[PDB]
Amino acid sequence: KELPVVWAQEGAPVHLPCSLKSPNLDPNFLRRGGVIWQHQPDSGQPRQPAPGRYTVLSVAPGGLRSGRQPLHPHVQLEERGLQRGDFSLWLRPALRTDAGEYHATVRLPNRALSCSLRLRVGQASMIASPSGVLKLSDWVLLNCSFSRPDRPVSVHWFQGQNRVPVYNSPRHFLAETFLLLPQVSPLDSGTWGCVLTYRDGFNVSITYNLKVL
Amino acid sequence: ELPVVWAQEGAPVHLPCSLKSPNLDPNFLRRGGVIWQHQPDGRYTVLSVAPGGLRSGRQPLHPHVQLEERGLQRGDFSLWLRPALRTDAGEYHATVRLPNRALSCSLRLRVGQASMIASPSGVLKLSDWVLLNCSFSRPDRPVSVHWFQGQNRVPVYNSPRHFLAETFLLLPQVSPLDSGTWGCVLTYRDGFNVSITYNLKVL
Ligand SMILES: *[C@@H]1O[C@H](CO)[C@@H](O)[C@H](O)[C@H]1NC(C)=O
Ligand SMILES: *[C@@H]1O[C@H](CO)[C@@H](O)[C@H](O)[C@H]1NC(C)=O
Ligand SMILES: *[C@@H]1O[C@H](CO)[C@@H](O)[C@H](O)[C@H]1NC(C)=O
Ligand SMILES: *[C@@H]1O[C@H](CO)[C@@H](O)[C@H](O)[C@H]1NC(C)=O
């Protein structure tokens, strides 16, 4: 079977999970764990060479840090989690170039274990048809879109400073990932927002400023 | 530099090359010969007809490139690409040989992609709304947009049941009379036309 896929939104932090799910307390045993995170970027794809792997993070087992600064400072580890057996990678800005395979090797006192993921990075946008700048009483269709190919499981719409929930109503028709405003009014000018949730739990938050003249 | 000719991928296009005021005998101008060269974006000849008025008969041969012999008799030596393909973009050079006259033509062909974007893009239920976008990949924006409905291509104007804005057509409430083909024509400032058809399916 293939690698589990983790999705990221470009510009937003992402968390690549690698965790002992049954840590039997013992913060003093799991203090002493260390991990190597390696990244296999996409070659793009006969008698081919094997894909290359380079180390993006290394923290030493034993319960100490050596004073070595991070090699790739946008890639990070939460050091509070190591006591709980959490060796997950944080990509502070998830970048397009960060896509590819991630391989963790964790060395504890008695054993070593591995974690393997494929990270894909997508782009979010509110697509406005005909446009975002509108005239009074025009119609507009907003699509809460993300470049992931599959269909999200839920879409939540919000409007205004305080994120007031937006439901199917006479002034707002909701269908799939789309919100149709049949007749914009002065109260429709301002910020709108959406949250897309996919079946793997990945969710995207998108904001957009509608202008009505 | 060169005149630009636009093409829609999947639709025929003709690269114009016509004698200015070509009113000679239709059997005199058929006896002309022409060479069309394409340097893709390495000049190579894509079709050559020899002067003298006789043919090799290989018109089914390479039918993606063609000359219309009615235009050849009318002094029109234009190249026809029956499916305009992505590979056809690039530089074109025509040379036409008559007994006492010569002509050369130089054009740049760019090919764009057309699509009817439907939101939502599936099959629709009666009384749903739907938005159609007549889109073309050309960078400049078209100067006019025309919408048509049905096999008989009846024009569609701004109304309560069909709202037109820019390149978009909104149908607020589909009915069984909306089932079937819809079409749009984009017209650009040079006269280039893009025709897109779309089959709406509604239960
Ligand atoms: C609208 O957004 C959804 C979610 O990303 C996407 O699957 C769909 O293709 C988009 N459609 C248009 C017309 O933008
Ligand atoms: C997305 O899912 C995560 C995981 O449960 C959750 O913490 C987050 O709150 C969800 N999205 C939003 C917009 O809150
Ligand atoms: C709709 O089509 C026009 C014409 O090419 C294009 O400029 C515009 O970006 C398209 N918008 C959407 C949402 O498809
Ligand atoms: C291009 O399309 C427009 C609108 O349908 C039409 O008026 C015009 O005559 C067309 N041009 C040609 C050369 O057919």
PDB file of N, CA and C and ligand atoms in Angstrom, chain B residues 144-148 153 184-188 191-195, ligand 4:
ATOM      1  N   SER B 144     -17.159  41.747 -27.444  1.00  0.00           N
ATOM      2  CA  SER B 144     -18.580  41.435 -27.348  1.00  0.00           C
ATOM      3  C   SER B 144     -18.784  39.947 -27.092  1.00  0.00           C
ATOM      4  N   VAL B 145     -19.926  39.631 -26.474  1.00  0.00           N
ATOM      5  CA  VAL B 145     -20.317  38.268 -26.124  1.00  0.00           C
ATOM      6  C   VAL B 145     -21.763  38.061 -26.556  1.00  0.00           C
ATOM      7  N   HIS B 146     -22.015  37.001 -27.320  1.00  0.00           N
ATOM      8  CA  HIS B 146     -23.362  36.664 -27.770  1.00  0.00           C
ATOM      9  C   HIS B 146     -23.743  35.254 -27.336  1.00  0.00           C
ATOM     10  N   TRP B 147     -24.967  35.095 -26.839  1.00  0.00           N
ATOM     11  CA  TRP B 147     -25.454  33.810 -26.354  1.00  0.00           C
ATOM     12  C   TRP B 147     -26.592  33.298 -27.229  1.00  0.00           C
ATOM     13  N   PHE B 148     -26.632  31.980 -27.411  1.00  0.00           N
ATOM     14  CA  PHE B 148     -27.591  31.311 -28.276  1.00  0.00           C
ATOM     15  C   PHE B 148     -28.076  30.046 -27.581  1.00  0.00           C
ATOM     16  N   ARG B 153     -30.347  27.702 -32.565  1.00  0.00           N
ATOM     17  CA  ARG B 153     -29.463  28.821 -32.230  1.00  0.00           C
ATOM     18  C   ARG B 153     -30.236  30.137 -32.074  1.00  0.00           C
ATOM     19  N   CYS B 184     -22.157  30.126 -27.151  1.00  0.00           N
ATOM     20  CA  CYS B 184     -21.699  31.494 -26.993  1.00  0.00           C
ATOM     21  C   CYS B 184     -20.657  31.795 -28.058  1.00  0.00           C
ATOM     22  N   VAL B 185     -20.592  33.068 -28.434  1.00  0.00           N
ATOM     23  CA  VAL B 185     -19.588  33.591 -29.349  1.00  0.00           C
ATOM     24  C   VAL B 185     -18.904  34.768 -28.671  1.00  0.00           C
ATOM     25  N   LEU B 186     -17.589  34.674 -28.530  1.00  0.00           N
ATOM     26  CA  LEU B 186     -16.748  35.773 -28.087  1.00  0.00           C
ATOM     27  C   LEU B 186     -16.189  36.454 -29.326  1.00  0.00           C
ATOM     28  N   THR B 187     -16.267  37.780 -29.362  1.00  0.00           N
ATOM     29  CA  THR B 187     -15.709  38.570 -30.448  1.00  0.00           C
ATOM     30  C   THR B 187     -14.685  39.533 -29.873  1.00  0.00           C
ATOM     31  N   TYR B 188     -13.486  39.494 -30.445  1.00  0.00           N
ATOM     32  CA  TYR B 188     -12.337  40.285 -30.040  1.00  0.00           C
ATOM     33  C   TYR B 188     -12.146  41.468 -30.985  1.00  0.00           C
ATOM     34  N   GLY B 191     -11.666  41.114 -34.741  1.00  0.00           N
ATOM     35  CA  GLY B 191     -12.642  40.353 -35.491  1.00  0.00           C
ATOM     36  C   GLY B 191     -12.589  38.860 -35.260  1.00  0.00           C
ATOM     37  N   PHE B 192     -11.634  38.384 -34.467  1.00  0.00           N
ATOM     38  CA  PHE B 192     -11.520  36.965 -34.159  1.00  0.00           C
ATOM     39  C   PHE B 192     -12.732  36.496 -33.366  1.00  0.00           C
ATOM     40  N   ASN B 193     -13.250  35.326 -33.728  1.00  0.00           N
ATOM     41  CA  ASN B 193     -14.443  34.788 -33.097  1.00  0.00           C
ATOM     42  C   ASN B 193     -14.158  33.436 -32.461  1.00  0.00           C
ATOM     43  N   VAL B 194     -14.741  33.233 -31.281  1.00  0.00           N
ATOM     44  CA  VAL B 194     -14.637  31.988 -30.531  1.00  0.00           C
ATOM     45  C   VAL B 194     -16.060  31.498 -30.332  1.00  0.00           C
ATOM     46  N   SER B 195     -16.348  30.286 -30.783  1.00  0.00           N
ATOM     47  CA  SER B 195     -17.658  29.687 -30.583  1.00  0.00           C
ATOM     48  C   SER B 195     -17.540  28.471 -29.679  1.00  0.00           C
TER      49      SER B 195
HETATM   50  C1  LIG C   4     -18.374  36.927 -35.180  1.00  0.00           C
HETATM   51  O1  LIG C   4     -19.427  36.767 -34.201  1.00  0.00           O
HETATM   52  C2  LIG C   4     -20.316  37.895 -34.122  1.00  0.00           C
HETATM   53  C3  LIG C   4     -21.300  37.604 -33.013  1.00  0.00           C
HETATM   54  O2  LIG C   4     -21.877  36.312 -33.149  1.00  0.00           O
HETATM   55  C4  LIG C   4     -20.989  38.125 -35.475  1.00  0.00           C
HETATM   56  O3  LIG C   4     -21.814  39.281 -35.395  1.00  0.00           O
HETATM   57  C5  LIG C   4     -19.933  38.306 -36.557  1.00  0.00           C
HETATM   58  O4  LIG C   4     -20.560  38.425 -37.830  1.00  0.00           O
HETATM   59  C6  LIG C   4     -18.989  37.108 -36.567  1.00  0.00           C
HETATM   60  N1  LIG C   4     -17.957  37.285 -37.576  1.00  0.00           N
HETATM   61  C7  LIG C   4     -17.841  36.503 -38.656  1.00  0.00           C
HETATM   62  C8  LIG C   4     -16.713  36.835 -39.587  1.00  0.00           C
HETATM   63  O5  LIG C   4     -18.608  35.570 -38.869  1.00  0.00           O
END
